[PDB]
Design a protein around this ligand. Structure first.
Ligand code: YDL
Ligand code: YDL
Lengths: 302, 302
């Protein structure tokens, strides 16, 4: 029993983290093959005013880079922008490059953050991509370049590189192609996050987890069609459910239909009445159906 | 900005996990050197009735063990009890044995759980040892033998191996010397957990983190001495603060004294009144002062 936000093991990613320093800036880079990827703003001369990245790459001095992993320093051969990321060809192939692919995470999907501090892997935790392309993590100075990843059907996927934090505390990053999530820009300009839309798929899985544990106070006999629930969701800042097929095992083992839980959401969306579901005071959308299944009946851990 | 329960990177521990099966029981073992450690109840024939471990070790058939790591199967040479743990001498040294030590965590101290499912490392997350020697994690069938660890001053410490779950959902394990935390017995008896005592040191760190992030609704002009709070905490299931010299840094740069936060605890212990601190609905004692400092000003990462 028990539900906890988790991260997939990080051992495969740790050997790819390097310290990247340029001028007075220090952050992290991803060393895979003969290439080091890091946020391009590390070569910006002043991150307090608008940045002319064209005029930063053209004045860059390759010898002024300092890339290191445990007293092993790499020389930069060439530098180019891949989106908002610098792609640095280095003079040494990473001997510990794992088999890997690249992909982007979508709203509601969970992935792992390897929080790195000035080149030192420090912690690992699970996160969830929000509707506006942001995550609510724990990033501070020197953690840019921290990598996000997911393991699926035994394949490492690099899906996130940290770039900045918005004024409201939300954390913005990019994919490994340099496309910033949510369309945000790596500039010190005032940028706003829209209304957050809660993942209905994850809230259903969250309620399934409570039932599996033994918490049943919020359930009744009432049900609601995915069509009636989707109509409400479009006006209550909730996503629309595309299928119940992802909840087949949960429904089979609990004996509760997705529609019965769709009704619990609209009813519980008005207030838990001082009550609690798995120690949470309101609806939680941080656990995906896969995350719940992995913890309750350790199946398909990747 | 941001506070999230995190785990230290697990790459150093992952290569020590093996699948241990005996008869119909399947769980995890820690393969370090020429020895594999796992909960001794893996040789129990019936885990629904009292177990005579003396008569189980005497009837044990070493060849009935199945220990494997990928395509590497290990042969058991000898077996002995170290407390509640089975110590199995094997015919092969783990080539990836890391430098390590063993120690026990104390109440209020945090550590990392590498959740393994029948020999497959599946996830990693942080936990906090409670006063009664239990943790509130997420363990299910087949996760016994999952190991807890901490990285301190560049030293890997093995500090936990999971054994069982109590009727109230609390999770029980032992250190690697075989001493069950909290004094529980590795028997299917209906054992009881006493009143949980909140770690005052960790709740203070939690409030410091909230202030650093930007929350202040809970702040008043009042403060409370450490003698007055300690007297209040002997009767409200909170630990006694022995010294404020663990928060000098947090108090110095937040501009709030421990005494102010001690008053916030006594008042907030009666309910947040619908409000939330860092998204929590009640006082949280799961973050140690060190954990907070690590996330707010990345220092002492190990
Ligand atoms: C990378 N190490 C930091 C991470 C940042 C520090 C505090 N909280 C965090 O997560 N990233 C940055 O410093 C970027 C780099 C600059 C720019 F994005 F290229 F312009 C500015 N950065 C910011 O994060 C700023 N945020 C912002 O620009 O909002 C538009 C702040 C938060 C002011 C550092
Ligand atoms: C190991 N894989 C499991 C983990 C267990 C499964 C469900 N929740 C968990 O954490 N551990 C066990 O099955 C032990 C082994 C037996 C014994 F401890 F040796 F007696 C029984 N176990 C239990 O966990 C039981 N709990 C218990 O004994 O209370 C003291 C339950 C969960 C009732 C099987």
């Amino acid at each position: 029993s028990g539900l906890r936000k988790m991260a997939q093991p990080s051992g495969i990613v740790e050997p790819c983290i390097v310290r990247v320093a340029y001028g007075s800036n220090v952050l992290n880079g991803l060393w895979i093959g003969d290439e080091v990827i890091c946020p391009r703003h590390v070569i910006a001369s002043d991150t307090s005013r608008v940045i002319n990245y064209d005029n930063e790459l053209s004045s860059v001095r390759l010898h002024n880079f300092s890339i290191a992993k445990n007293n092993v320093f790499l020389g930069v051969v060439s530098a180019k922008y891949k989106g908002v990321n610098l792609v640095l060809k280095v003079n040494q192939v990473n001997p510990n490059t794992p088999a890997h692919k690249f992909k982007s995470v979508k709203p509601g999907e969970s992935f792992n953050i390897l929080a790195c501090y000035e080149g030192c892997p420090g912690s690992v935790y699970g996160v969830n991509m929000r509707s506006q392309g942001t995550i609510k993590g724990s990033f501070i100075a020197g953690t840019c370049g921290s990598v996000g990843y997911v393991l699926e059907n035994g394949i490492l996927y690099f899906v996130y590189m940290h770039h900045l934090e918005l004024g409201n505390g939300s954390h913005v990053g990019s994919n490994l192609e340099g496309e910033m999530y949510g369309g945000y820009e790596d500039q010190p300009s005032m940028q706003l996050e829209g209304t957050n839309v809660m993942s209905s798929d994850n809230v259903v899985a969250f309620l399934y987890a409570a039932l599996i544990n033994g918490e049943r106070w919020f359930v009744t006999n009432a049900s609601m069609s995915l069509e009636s629930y989707n109509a409400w969701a479009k006006t209550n800042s909730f996503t629309e459910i595309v299928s119940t097929d992802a909840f087949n095992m949960l429904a089979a083992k609990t004996g509760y239909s997705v529609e019965k839980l769709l009704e619990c959401i609209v009813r519980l969306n008005k207030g838990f009445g001082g009550r609690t579901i798995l120690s949470y005071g309101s609806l939680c959308d941080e656990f995906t159906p896969t995350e719940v299944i992995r913890q309750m009946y350790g199946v398909n851990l990747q």
